[PDB]
Swiss-Prot record, chains A, B:
Organism: Homo sapiens
Lipidation feature positions (GPI-anchor amidated serine): S524
Protein name as it appears in the record: 5'-nucleotidase
Binding positions (Zn(2+) 1): D11, H13, D60
Enzyme Commission code: 3.1.3.35, 3.1.3.5, 3.1.3.89, 3.1.3.91
């Protein structure tokens, strides 16, 4: 039997440095986790012990910290080249800076193949990008070869900025003929590596004949066999076994997000490329694994430009930005309005004739707003100022919620009003009126929402059965601040851009801001 | 006696081409007026007949048409140099593109002295601008000399973009020592040429000892002795005689605006520089005066880049811009919101610790909105599209109105609601609620306004005795669409930027717009 060791990452999201246990800023270094210097140590150790190793990334290196803001993907090519990745699939966030922001910094600089079989280009872009990403690559491993076939979320146009000159095809439709072609080329060991989420990964494993292993991402899925080593709760066993339509057992793997774990799957193959066995588990990259000193020293050199950038003027405010708890946990605050307006601006995507924009609505818990910004420093706003407002290292995510769920969220917002608690909601594209004289659970007396399926945006009453797209913090999508109804009732969730980055981009674009308190939230 | 002919313009405001009788676009060429080619003809004729002639401009050549938008003052230097102006005073609109937009195109290119005695600079700007404008110039005229002393509105920081490195001094305080110094230099014939408005011009004539003549501007004042030749109604005789504190008769002149008239004042002086007599009248530049063919051919050559610019993309909309009368004469319309938001953005000026911005409020009659803009031309917006929305060649002006006046304006807005009439108001920084079941004059049931004297902008009830700054069309400041209360009751009026230009600048800055209907105007 021929044994392959698959090492894999996904949704690293700009965690070049070690992090806290929750993937935010490292404060207590003796208990920090992840980062590329520690990954380097572990990969190097495994490559010293195992003959046949592939190191794969399932996409979404782009977006997540000030690293991406400043280096715009150059850090991804540099550090992925230093760890000698064997292949990467394109994720949705690889399109955040458009096609141009993918071609240059990443496709032209990577020393490893970058894969997606379900993205096509037309017009002059097709010539410009031809061969810079591939449907698949056949890689030599010891005396054998392994085919790696890529895929990227069909939903990327709604979740990033790929532009109007790329088409994202159905993953299974695109994959099958490529896997069929590899079999004609005498390649009998096939890995599907891609970025569509665990549910699609299971469909690919079931339906794409000839796929031996699926290595996925996007959904930040944690799989584990046994007692988990940290706080993440497994969604299933590692690997997750799918019974294929042709009667084979096909392992499906993912490795959470943020570089906290290295996925590790051992596969035994027979002479004909059938999987005989698969076993493994993600490895927690905790402080017991030393950071490689060389990579750490390069990280520290690259940090200098981040420190410099952190104190530069992004733009100006002519108004006090009221992020005080005394305001934002009690009533509409202009900091809340600013952040929600930034959130909606970040989620402007290509719009057909059926909507002005696919999403119009935002909620933001007041507990997530942690500082004001004074306008009397010549109006300057810096990244450091925004990091005091938004200190948790979160994202502003896209969800789909029934109107009944959103009404329950607004009732929760004021259920125990008057105690300075974090659940009070700041809003965009929503007008709410509360009557605090009513019983908890029955305090929302008006709730109007901005249309999407309209040429002129205007407000209509919320409909209990309609499904709304809403931008909100990952903290709320995960049921933080008692929003268990959002976690339990949402119909779709996709992780978005870094919180600070969303607001910094908006401020830079606007140049001078003056957010008002304008009646989005009233009391009767 | 030594006789001087003073020819003078003021507030030409980018009317390089001949205009209609109302100073808008020329449609019926056989009845058009003004423009620099016709001015050239008349000036040349007078200089052939009169030995001692000065041609003076009292400021505000900048701002008013697409000429200024595209050529940014290069057209002003070029055509003022071609007509051989003898001197110009700085107007408020000469600062619309900042100090940098005055130094280059105008101060470095003019072949005539540019004057203001009451503007000082500090820091590095003082070195950069030293001598590029002067307090005064002594000009030879025949065998004599004439001193010309300039001044510029002390209110310029509120009415343009001069920046924080210029100080505008009290005009009379600054002028007196300069006029005193000219007398020590044996200059006994002194013209005060400046840009503060007719009321200040009369104060200068009264109080600045040694001023023989005041040639003013800013207030677009029309003076005439006799039956007027066109539609403008005189504010007084030409010249307007002020009795000075030292007992002299001091003539004060102005010549309306828009290049429609050439001011013409004949002064007789004695040997000691005392005015013996003054008489004259502005000359209507109507179609009986031919356009100079050479200047007209140069105007037509410069027009090519304007035509090209007119069809260029300024920015994008992802929403239908509803400028239909069926919307904007009946309810809040998103075109109205866009234009008022552009108006407030245009009037962001330097703000001390006492206000976030000096003005927060906007009204716009629906009758002034003359077209929608469709978003389905790939979202493109062009100048030509904006000219269909705003076709009248107006300005967005700054006024001061008591709250009682503004309440009367909102009652007028709906006094005869339901007939598709032009007075229905679109708004910014104002939230109004109407009850149409009430008697005309008593339909406004809520009227809240955005604060200025606040660090966080928020809405408060309108106060009847408080004076508000409001941005509104010149058409309304002049009592158009039945707003006689605005004309009759306003406390201050200053003309603003060209309507199209205000909206085009905002669209270019924003890049992608998506104005909503959001509840600024409600019905109960
Ligand atoms: O909004 C929040 N995000 C994360 C934490 I931890 C919290 O208290 N609040
Ligand atoms: O708003 C307007 N400006 C100018 C005219 I003439 C008119 O009808 N309406
Ligand atoms: Ca196989
Ligand atoms: Ca004199
Ligand atoms: Zn991701
Ligand atoms: Zn993803
Ligand atoms: Zn003017
Ligand atoms: Zn002026």
């Amino acid at each position: 039997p021929w044994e392959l060791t698959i090492l894999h990452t996904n949704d690293v999201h700009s965690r070049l440095e070690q992090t806290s246990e929750d993937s935010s800023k490292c404060v207590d270094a003796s208990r920090c986790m992840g980062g590329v210097a520690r990954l380097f140590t572990k990969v190097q150790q495994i490559r010293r012990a195992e003959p046949n190793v592939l190191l794969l990334d399932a996409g979404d290196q782009y977006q997540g910290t000030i690293w991406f803001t400043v280096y715009k993907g150059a850090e991804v090519a540099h550090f992925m080249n230093a760890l000698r990745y064997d292949a990467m699939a394109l994720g949705n966030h690889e399109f955040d800076n458009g096609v141009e922001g993918l071609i240059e910094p990443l496709l032209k600089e990577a020393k490893f193949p970058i894969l997606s079989a379900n993205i096509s280009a037309s017009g002059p872009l097709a010539s410009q990008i031809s061969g810079l990403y591939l449907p698949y690559k056949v890689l030599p491993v010891g005396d054998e070869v392994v085919g790696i076939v890529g895929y990227t979320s069909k939903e990327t146009p709604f979740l990033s900025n790929p532009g109007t000159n790329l088409v994202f095809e159905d993953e299974i439709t695109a994959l099958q003929p490529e896997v069929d072609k590899l079999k004609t080329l005498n390649v009998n060991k096939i890995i599907a590596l891609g970025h569509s989420g665990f549910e699609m990964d299971k469909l690919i494993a079931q339906k794409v004949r000839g796929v031996d292993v699926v290595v996925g991402g996007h959904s930040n899925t944690f799989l584990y066999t046994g007692n988990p080593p940290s706080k993440e709760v497994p969604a299933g066993k590692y690997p997750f076994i799918v019974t294929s339509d042709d009667g084979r057992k096909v392992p499906v793997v993912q490795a959470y997000a943020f570089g906290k774990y290295l996925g590790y799957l051992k596969i035994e193959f027979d002479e004909r490329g059938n999987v005989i066995s698969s076993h493994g588990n993600p490895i927690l990259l905790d402080s017991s694994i030393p950071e490689d000193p060389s990579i750490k020293a390069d990280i520290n050199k690259w940090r200098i430009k981040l420190d410099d950038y952190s104190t530069q003027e992004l733009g100006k405010t002519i108004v006090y930005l009221d992020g005080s708890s005394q305001s934002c946990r009690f009533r509409e605050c202009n900091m809340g309005n600013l952040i929600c307006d930034a959130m909606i601006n970040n989620n402007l995507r290509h719009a057909d004739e059926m909507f002005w924009n696919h999403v119009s609505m935002c909620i933001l818990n007041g507990g997530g707003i942690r500082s004001p910004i004074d306008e009397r420093n010549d109006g300057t706003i810096t990244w450091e100022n925004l990091a005091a407002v938004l200190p948790f290292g979160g994202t502003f995510d896209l969800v789909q919620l029934k109107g009944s769920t959103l009404k329950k969220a607004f009732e929760h917002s004021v259920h125990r009003y008057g105690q300075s608690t974090g659940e009070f909601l700041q809003v965009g594209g929503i007008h709410v009126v509360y009557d605090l004289s009513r019983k908890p659970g029955d305090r929302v007396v008006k709730l109007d929402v901005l249309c999407t399926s309209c040429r002129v945006p205007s407000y209509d009453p919320l409909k209990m059965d309609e499904v709304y797209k809403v931008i909100l913090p990952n903290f709320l999508a995960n049921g933080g601040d008692g929003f268990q109804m959002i976690k339990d009732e949402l119909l779709r969730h996709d992780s978005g851009d870094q919180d600070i980055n969303v607001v910094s981009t908006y401020i830079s674009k606007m140049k001078v801001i003056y957010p008002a308190v304008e009646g989005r939230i009233k009391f009767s």
